[PDB]
Amino acid sequence: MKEITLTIDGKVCKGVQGDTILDVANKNDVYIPTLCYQKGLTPIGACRMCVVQLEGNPKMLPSCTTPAQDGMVVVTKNEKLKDYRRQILELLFAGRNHFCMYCSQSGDCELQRLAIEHEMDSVRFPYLYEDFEVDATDPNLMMDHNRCVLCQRCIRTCSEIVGAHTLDLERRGWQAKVIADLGKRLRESDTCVNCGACAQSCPTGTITIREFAYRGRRSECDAVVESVCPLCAVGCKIKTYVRTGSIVRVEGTGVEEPDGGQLCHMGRWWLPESTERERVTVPLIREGASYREATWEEALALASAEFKKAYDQEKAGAILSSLCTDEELTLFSALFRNALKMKHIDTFDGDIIRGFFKGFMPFREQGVRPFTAAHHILDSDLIITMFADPQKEAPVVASYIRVACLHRNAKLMNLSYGPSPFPGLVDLDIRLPEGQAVPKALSNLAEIIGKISIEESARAMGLDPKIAEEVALMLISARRPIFIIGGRATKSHELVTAACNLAVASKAFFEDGLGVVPLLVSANSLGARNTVVSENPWLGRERRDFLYVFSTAMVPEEEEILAAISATRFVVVQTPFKVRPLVNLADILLPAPAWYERSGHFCTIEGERRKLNTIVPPKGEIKSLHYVMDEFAKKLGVKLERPEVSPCEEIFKSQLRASEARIVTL
Amino acid sequence: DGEVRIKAPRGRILDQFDPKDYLDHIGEHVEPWSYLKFPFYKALGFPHGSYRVGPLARLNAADAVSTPEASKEFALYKE
Amino acid sequence: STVDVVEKVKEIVAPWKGKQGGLIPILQEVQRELGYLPEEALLTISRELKMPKAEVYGVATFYAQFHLKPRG
Ligand code: SF4
Ligand code: SF4
Ligand code: SF4
Ligand code: SF4
Ligand code: FES
After folding, report:
1. What is the DSSP letter of A277?
2. Residue from A205, A208, A202, A171 nearest A186 by CA
3. Pocket residues for ligand 2 (CB within 6 Å)?
4. What CATH number corresponds to the domain at position C27?
5. Cis peptide upstream of residue A370 (ω within 30 degrees of 0)
6. Which residue of A155, A158, A159, A209 sits with most ligand 2 atoms within 8 Å of its CB, as the best mutation to test the pocket?
7. Is residue C19 included in any domain, yes or no?
8. Cβ(A434)–Cβ(A461) under 8 Å?
9. Which of A88, A96, A466, A532 is 20 to 30 Å from the Cα of A585, by its Cα?
10. How many domains does chain C contain in total?
11. Which residues contact residue A658 at a Cβ distance below 8 angstroms, ignoring those fewer than 6 apart?
12. Whole-angstrom Cα distance, residue A314 to residue A344?
């Protein structure tokens, strides 16, 4: 049938034969008390607050773990159930030490709300005054075990959703406790990624983000806006909470998607920490070791005066940010690429972008999409990490890797000259020596398409024949492998093709493309390429006498890029913050809107666009970015010719299905 | 006495700070072939944050001098 | 010695690698040959079976037969 119907509280509800009673109740509107239930986690059955009874049967059934069967009458509210639930809440309060007066979650705690809805004004039990540890060793997260209901939703979030299995239960019985690795404090645990997925999963105020205590209460917010995390390419959906013009809490929407709502340390620490920064708010001038306030006319006049006297002598450049939206990039490109005919328009991440694209183009000319969705790592069997460190570039990808290798029985092998970014999950660390190992790798995978020689192709790879032999032996025994190619490999557009060829040489196909899943550092990769990113590297080579640098000062920049900016003899930055690395190397420091103040679409690598919503409206009146672009177009003798956005063109089309072709273009 | 001042290779002053706040700005990189370390400005790393010290770097970072016959030659050095 | 137990428990986890189970017998045999489960033993068991440290400490402290400190 797959279409059943029940009667909850007299109200007839519809559902499917596979769900539980709590799911059928939540599906329409119906309310049932829950404390250990979390959408996105397998039902646990610990609080026993969701108890429910049928007519005739005097037994009590947990609505969250008992399946729904057509024809049953469900009763959620009566004297017996109210009494039992109040007794459970009173046990929870009398067992542990609940001090609502100074709890950080003292207005948005599930236990406190369940206690107030059941009219709890006494505990009726002797109030065991036991000493529980308060763990504040980690500067960011606090675990106050005086407030634990032992719902285990923290142990289920760090195991099935995150992968960093840092939490579990200590000694059984009433002495149950949530511990870190080997009973250590959270700060001594090495298997923690500081993602805060546990803080979002905890219903009580045991796990708490420390720096936003007493402010990040969802009950005393002013507005809730959902948008996307701009920091990395994964683009996790968020649930920003705003209070008095400040982001107090970032929660992960998407408890239905494979990410599970876990955001990275950046997504839920930097974004609320960004709204309380120094906010340039007025054009500055260096004046020598100490900035000075200036009007817009003065700052723009001096900036354009130094910009003209350098553009005539071929020496000028622009370093834009790929965390910018498609409209800002379109305007920048309209000024620099289609109005000034400039040639030095690189991006802070232009090298990774140009490398990935020039390594994947050997496959665009034959009609194959040379990558797949990042969430297929869970369905794989052998994950090969090629010059990647996802814990610093794409934490949700690292979470997929950990979940697959620790709970879905996958094998991990490293193929990089690095620190083996997963020291304890890899079983084959293949460290390549530098030089020209790209042709070596491509000839090595050539044998896997034909014979499936090796010694000759395993000399610059710095592997004795045996090492490369069993590398190939494990690569051939895998039915659905996957490769993770990092941004280091983009130091040469050859190694990207080498990885994409190792992908075809082992039949790593998916219905969306190959098993390559590149780790892009920004989200507007295709947008930046089509608009701003240059074709040849020029930073650190051209001395440069003038430089425009638009940097949304959110993610750090490579030391080399900043050293090239420091030697440019004039830099005009249009950052919104007064952070250290940009106020150190800057001459004007014009103000610009922050990421939580403008809207955009973020044309991505895999095709169709995302959408960033404006969370907090702009405070002051900076009044434009087109203004600066015209005062640079004027004072220089050009027209801007305002264009509209270029459409998403799906650069890598899936024309023909999974018909591999080794590309001898080395 | 005075404050520590680092000048970019083209004249701009980059992180003029107070001497006691040096652990926030200077770090030493160690190389296997020398008992000598390599100090560098931390915000630019190694080997990009490395700078020069000495008479040349002093006269380049300082803006003026306080003695007559040395100023009369500091001008000729600056030009 | 803390270095003796490393290899000594390596030789006890050897017959169990890649066999989908049998962790409480490993802990039982490390208890039989040491009288208690030290932190080094648990760390090496976790590193060899590639089972998280939280899991091995949770199952080691679940049963009353085991002991995390040297016994009298
Ligand atoms: S966790 Fe909830 S019930 Fe416990 S003290 Fe804090 S607000 Fe009160
Ligand atoms: S911060 Fe993340 S990794 Fe650490 S315990 Fe919490 S959920 Fe697990
Ligand atoms: S810390 Fe929070 S989520 Fe974890 S068991 Fe205790 S109450 Fe539940
Ligand atoms: S993984 Fe990327 S998209 Fe997700 S929260 Fe972190 S930075 Fe944002
Ligand atoms: S909520 Fe139904 S048993 Fe915990």
Report:
1. S
2. A208
3. A 141, 157-158, 162, 164, 166-167, 192-198
4. 1.10.10.1590
5. no
6. A158
7. yes
8. no
9. A532
10. 1
11. A368, A509, A510, A511
12. 10
